[PDB]
Amino acid sequence: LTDEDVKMITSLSKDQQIGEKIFASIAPSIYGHEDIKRGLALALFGGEPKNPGGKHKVRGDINVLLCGDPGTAKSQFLKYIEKVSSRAIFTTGQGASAVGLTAYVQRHPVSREWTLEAGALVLADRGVCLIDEFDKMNDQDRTSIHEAMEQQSISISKAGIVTSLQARCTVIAAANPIGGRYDPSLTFSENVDLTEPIISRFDILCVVRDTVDPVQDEMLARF
Amino acid sequence: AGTVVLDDVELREAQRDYLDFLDDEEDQGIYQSKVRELISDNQYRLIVNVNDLRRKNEKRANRLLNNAFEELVAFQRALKDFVASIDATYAKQYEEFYVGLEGSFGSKHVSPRTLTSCFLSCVVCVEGIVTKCSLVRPKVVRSVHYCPATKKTIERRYSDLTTLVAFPSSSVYPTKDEENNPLETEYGLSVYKDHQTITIQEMPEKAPAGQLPRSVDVILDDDLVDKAKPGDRVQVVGTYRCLPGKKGGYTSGTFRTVLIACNVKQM
Ligand SMILES: Nc1ncnc2c1ncn2[C@@H]1O[C@H](COP(=O)(O)OP(=O)(O)OP(=O)(O)O)[C@@H](O)[C@H]1O
Ligand SMILES: [Mg+2]
């Protein structure tokens, strides 16, 4: 699908300011947050997975966690990544999402067909899972996300289905701090309301702090 | 009347061999003593050790294992003859003496999962756990009717066509006389047989992990009906057969299978 595309993107790459151009092109509707946009660009382009022999798997996915107080456009960042990225699926820590983190097997409500409904972690095997409200997830959701992040696999042992299916997604998560206001006095681990094993599997941890800064407020209001 | 066999060579040979095996008097009277013990205990089901049967006559053992109904009928005829010879009054008291099997079944010993269609019409010893049981119902094996209008007393017999072709004629319960005289059944004089249906499921500790369990339906009759209750780790030795479908006109080729138990054992 890329012929004149591939003709021109090489020239854009040689432009020699392509990195800054991309970092500025991410989230054109979100003001500021240059660091967040840069991290999201790095996550979008991803890394290089590798596995010395067949025994030392190392992921090539750059996981991102935006922990921030309300009114900081974390949801807008996730929605923009949904819009841009291919194979991008948006799930929420609440129960009000079309898909869910945990995989199950049941007869579909519409198709009336016995289906192995794999989770939103598996529906983005080679894409991005946008987990909003990452701090408000059930015990099963937390265990599922732990399994996906640490193993990149999801194991079902449900009815007679004993399977292990791959979910090699890049996780972009949005979370709020304990009390609804990030406090730098404490550390990120005890600010975020998440388990340390869960936090560890994130490459980028964007602390989206909100402060009453005259110029920033004026510019954001203008936007 | 109808067709009546005169010279069934296979049936005669089977009866002769089974009676020779049951003689046992020279062979340290093991089965002679067993027959005497069941006579004294007032039982009408002989449990035979298939290992001893194979040792005596491997041919008969193989024939019995691979052809269940015919050889079991021959064995029951031989057992009834032996019971009459030892004591005639008891033989006349009990119409049919049943034979159940026991011992080491080389390949026939299976579970509800490994029990495939390759074992139809064979003797299979299936282990499992009783998932459910049914109420013990009486099936009429010989009904007696009295006609007040004529004082006549008729007796109808119904054969055990559980796994055999059955026609409406055999399973019609008389309700009138040839002259349309209402009948009245003599329940006391009638002969009933207790019948029960259980379900044997593969033992969870034996079933492959993570899979759904495999079940089988078992039919128990007189003197075996209440040998087990739900949750019993039972060994059922029986004959695996296809249950006839209802008179159709179009058949899908699908046949429910079932195990006619000839013996039930607990741990
Ligand atoms: N930096 C920004 N530039 C432009 N609009 C912004 C910015 N931050 C927030 N907004 C707008 O302000 C409102 C708040 O954003 P949004 O609803 O995404 O909040 P949020 O970070 O998801 O909050 P919460 O975590 O409380 O759900 C929205 O209208 C969003 O468009
Ligand atoms: Mg939000």
Query: How many Å apart are CA B175 and CA B147, to the nearest integer?
Result: 10
Ion ligand 2: protein residues whose beta carbon lies under 5 Å: A 74-75
The two tokens of residue A44 are 């979008």
From chain B, the residues in CB contact with A156 under 8 A are none
What residues are in contact with ligand 1 under a 6 Å CB criterion? A 30-33, 70-76, 176, 220, 223
Q: Is B49 in a helix, a strand, or coil?
A: strand
Whether A159 has its CB under 8 Å from any CB of chain B: the answer is yes
Location of structure tokens 């006349």: B92
Q: Which amino acid is at B234?
A: V
CB atoms within 10 A of CB A76: 14
Within 13 Å and on the Cβ side, how many CA atoms surround B240?
22
In 10 A of CB A210, how many CB atoms? 13
Beta bridge partners of A173: A65, A131
The answer to the question of whether A76 is labelled as a binding residue is yes
* Locus of tokens 């999801």: A154
Smallest Cα distance from A153 to chain B, Å: 18
The answer to whether the annotation marks A164 as part of a ligand binding site is no
Q: Cα separation of B59 and B18, whole Å?
A: 11
User: Considering only CB atoms, which chain A residues are within 8 Å of B212?
Assistant: 159-160
Contacts of B211 in chain A (CB under 8 A): 160, 162
Amino acid (one-letter) located at A113: E
**Residues of B within an 8 Å Cβ radius of A:** 209-212
Structure determined by: cryo-EM
Minimal CA–CA distance to B100: which of B81, B119, B125? B125
Q: Please give the distance of CA B59 from its chain centroid, rounded to a whole number.
A: 22
Q: Kindly determine whether residue A162 and residue B211, on different chains, have CB atoms separated by under 8 Å.
A: yes
d(CA B219, CA A95): 49
- Closest ligand, as measured to the CA of A208: 1
The residue written with tokens 């997830």 in the block is A137
For residue B148, the SS3 value is: coil
CA proximity to B111, closest of B234, B247, B264: B234
Residue A180 DSSP label: G
How far, in Å, are A69, A135, B30 from residue B72 at the CA level? Answer: 82, 70, 20
CA distance B9 to B13: 6
Strand partners, A114: A107
- Number of Cβ within 10 Å of residue B255's Cβ equals 14
Which stretch of DSSP H or E encloses residue B77? helix B68-86
Flag whether residue A160 sits within 8 Å of chain B, measured between CB atoms.
yes
**B-interface mutation test, from A105, A114, A162, most B Cβ less than 10 A away:** A162
How far B209 CA lies from chain A's nearest CA (Å)?
9
SS (H, E, C) B85-126: HHCHHHHHHCCCCEEEEECCCCCCEECCCCCCHHHCCCEEEE
Amino acid at B59: K
* Resolution of the structure, angstroms: 2.8
- Tokens representing B82? 């032996």
